[PDB]
Amino acid sequence: LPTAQEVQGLMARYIELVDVGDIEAIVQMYADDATVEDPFGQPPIHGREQIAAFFRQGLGGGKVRACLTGPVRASHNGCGAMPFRVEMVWNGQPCALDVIDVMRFDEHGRIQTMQAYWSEVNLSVR
């Protein structure tokens, strides 16, 4: 499995691909066999058409920005969690959503599982 140092760099790059709004580059970082539980507690999303309809529904348009708000934590078993924020729109205006994702990386370096922790309690209108 990715080295912890490496799981870090796949996770900071991800915030990169999310932020520039490159949905296509976000959907190659995943596995055939992946789930998106986003937000965690919802069923999970799987299948490459499906997920890709997830990142398109959430980052299509451009107007979503996302940055790490502290360092990626990683393990030695190819996993890792990171804190970040997102600036987007809700109820017509500027909001922000605080987020931690946790990612499990398969033996090919692709997101085998991603889980995304947030809810309202992690929204601030601005």
- Residue ranges of the binding site for substrate: 101
> Distance (Å, rounded) from C-alpha 119 to C-alpha 43?
15
* Contact call for residues 97 and 125 (beta carbons, < 8 A): no
84 to 123: interface string for Mg ion, x by CB under 5 A: ----------------------------------------
Nearer to Mg ion, 6 or 16 (CB): 16
Nearer to Mg ion, 19 or 98 (CB): 19
**x/- track of binding to its own copies for residues 46-85 (CB under 8 A):** -----------------------xxx-xxxxx-xxxxx--
Task: Examine the residue annotation and report whether 33 is marked as an active-site residue of this protein.
Answer: no
Residue 23 near residue 55, CB atoms below 8 Å: yes
Applying CB under 8 A, among 49, 57, 120, 126 the residue interacting with its own copies is 120
Q: Is residue 92 near its own copies by the rule CB under 8 A?
A: no
Q: Closer to Mg ion by CB, 70 or 125: give it.
A: 70
Is 38 designated active site?
Answer: yes
